[PDB]
Protein backbone atom coordinates (compact mmCIF):
# COMPACT_ATOMS: atom_id res chain seq x y z
CA UNK A 1 0.00 0.00 0.00
CA UNK A 2 1.51 3.30 -0.67
CA UNK A 3 -0.24 5.81 1.85
CA UNK A 4 -0.96 9.32 1.34
CA UNK A 5 0.78 12.00 3.37
CA UNK A 6 -1.79 12.89 5.45
CA UNK A 7 -2.88 9.73 5.65
CA UNK A 8 0.09 7.85 7.65
CA UNK A 9 0.23 11.04 9.59
CA UNK A 10 -3.56 10.17 10.46
CA UNK A 11 -2.56 5.98 10.92
CA UNK A 12 0.99 6.46 12.38
CA UNK A 13 -0.98 8.38 15.46
CA UNK A 14 -3.81 6.33 15.88
CA UNK A 15 -0.79 3.53 16.55
CA UNK A 16 0.54 5.96 19.14
CA UNK A 17 3.70 7.29 17.08
CA UNK A 18 2.76 10.90 17.67
CA UNK A 19 5.02 11.91 20.52
CA UNK A 20 6.57 8.80 21.03
CA UNK A 21 9.94 9.10 23.01
CA UNK A 22 9.88 12.76 22.09
CA UNK A 23 9.56 12.51 18.47
CA UNK A 24 6.71 14.90 17.27
CA UNK A 25 4.38 13.04 14.35
CA UNK A 26 6.15 14.97 11.40
CA UNK A 27 9.48 13.36 12.16
CA UNK A 28 7.96 10.07 11.78
CA UNK A 29 6.30 11.04 8.56
CA UNK A 30 9.20 12.55 7.31
CA UNK A 31 11.57 9.37 8.25
CA UNK A 32 8.52 7.11 6.29
CA UNK A 33 9.17 9.34 2.95
CA UNK A 34 12.59 9.35 2.72
CA UNK A 35 12.90 5.45 3.86
CA UNK A 36 9.81 4.13 1.33
CA UNK A 37 7.96 6.95 -0.38
CA UNK A 38 5.47 5.80 1.85
CA UNK A 39 5.22 2.78 0.49
CA UNK A 40 4.22 -0.79 2.76
CA UNK A 41 5.94 -2.64 0.26
CA UNK A 42 9.56 -1.37 -0.29
CA UNK A 43 12.19 -3.40 0.46
CA UNK A 44 16.16 -2.51 0.00
CA UNK A 45 19.02 -4.79 0.54
CA UNK A 46 22.01 -3.87 2.64
CA UNK A 47 26.00 -4.35 1.38
CA UNK A 48 26.22 -6.61 3.89
CA UNK A 49 23.50 -8.96 3.28
CA UNK A 50 20.82 -7.92 5.49
CA UNK A 51 17.76 -6.20 4.18
CA UNK A 52 15.35 -3.19 4.97
CA UNK A 53 11.37 -4.17 5.11
CA UNK A 54 8.26 -1.35 4.93
CA UNK A 55 7.59 2.21 5.18
CA UNK A 56 10.33 2.40 7.92
CA UNK A 57 13.13 0.39 6.24
CA UNK A 58 13.46 -2.00 9.44
CA UNK A 59 16.64 -4.35 9.17
CA UNK A 60 16.63 -7.83 9.20
CA UNK A 61 20.02 -7.59 11.05
CA UNK A 62 18.39 -6.45 14.20
CA UNK A 63 14.90 -6.64 14.32
CA UNK A 64 13.18 -9.30 12.04
CA UNK A 65 13.68 -12.71 10.81
CA UNK A 66 13.74 -13.20 6.87
CA UNK A 67 15.25 -16.75 6.99
CA UNK A 68 18.48 -14.92 5.29
CA UNK A 69 20.66 -12.92 6.88
CA UNK A 70 23.16 -15.06 9.11
CA UNK A 71 24.02 -14.61 12.47
CA UNK A 72 21.16 -11.69 12.89
CA UNK A 73 18.81 -11.04 15.48
CA UNK A 74 14.89 -10.81 15.91
CA UNK A 75 13.98 -8.47 18.53
CA UNK A 76 10.94 -7.82 17.59
CA UNK A 77 9.97 -10.98 17.07
CA UNK A 78 8.08 -10.67 13.87
CA UNK A 79 8.88 -12.13 10.60
CA UNK A 80 10.08 -8.92 8.11
CA UNK A 81 7.09 -10.02 5.46
CA UNK A 82 4.49 -8.63 8.10
CA UNK A 83 6.20 -5.28 7.97
CA UNK A 84 5.38 -5.06 4.65
CA UNK A 85 1.33 -5.43 5.26
CA UNK A 86 -0.88 -2.52 4.13
CA UNK A 87 -1.34 -2.67 8.33
CA UNK A 88 1.05 -0.27 9.52
CA UNK A 89 0.75 -2.02 13.21
CA UNK A 90 3.65 -4.09 13.14
CA UNK A 91 5.85 -1.53 11.57
CA UNK A 92 4.87 1.00 14.15
CA UNK A 93 4.90 -1.61 17.15
CA UNK A 94 9.18 -2.43 15.88
CA UNK A 95 9.55 1.26 15.43
CA UNK A 96 8.84 1.98 18.73
CA UNK A 97 11.00 -0.98 20.37
CA UNK A 98 14.33 0.76 17.89
CA UNK A 99 13.81 4.49 18.83
CA UNK A 100 13.45 3.75 22.57
CA UNK A 101 16.72 1.62 22.24
CA UNK A 102 19.28 4.44 23.24
CA UNK A 103 20.04 6.02 19.82
CA UNK A 104 16.68 7.88 19.10
CA UNK A 105 15.34 8.14 15.82
CA UNK A 106 19.22 8.63 14.82
CA UNK A 107 18.45 4.96 13.99
CA UNK A 108 16.99 5.53 10.62
CA UNK A 109 20.16 7.41 8.74
CA UNK A 110 17.77 9.49 6.45
CA UNK A 111 15.59 10.56 9.37
CA UNK A 112 19.61 11.68 10.82
CA UNK A 113 20.32 12.93 7.32
CA UNK A 114 17.48 14.39 5.80
CA UNK A 115 14.67 15.01 8.41
CA UNK A 116 16.60 15.81 11.77
CA UNK A 117 17.06 19.73 12.70
CA UNK A 118 14.73 20.50 9.74
CA UNK A 119 10.59 21.66 9.87
CA UNK A 120 9.23 18.28 10.28
CA UNK A 121 6.09 20.13 11.00
CA UNK A 122 5.55 20.88 7.03
CA UNK A 123 4.94 16.97 6.76
CA UNK A 124 1.47 16.86 9.24
CA UNK A 125 0.51 20.65 8.00
CA UNK A 126 -3.11 21.06 7.07
CA UNK A 127 -3.58 17.13 8.30
CA UNK A 128 -7.16 16.34 10.20
CA UNK A 129 -6.01 14.67 12.57
CL1 LIG B 1 5.50 17.63 13.86
CL1 LIG C 1 16.19 1.12 11.17
CL1 LIG D 1 18.30 -15.16 9.41
CL1 LIG E 1 15.95 10.82 21.83
NA1 LIG F 1 17.05 -11.17 11.57
Same mark, same amino acid.
Given at each position: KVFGRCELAAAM? $????? /?? $??? *??? /???? =? =?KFESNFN?? =?? /? $?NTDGSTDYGILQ? /? *?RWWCNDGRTPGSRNLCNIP? *??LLSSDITASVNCAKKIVSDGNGMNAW? =?? $???CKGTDVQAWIRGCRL
Open positions: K $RHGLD /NY $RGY *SLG /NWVC =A =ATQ =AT /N $RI /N *SC *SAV =AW $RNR
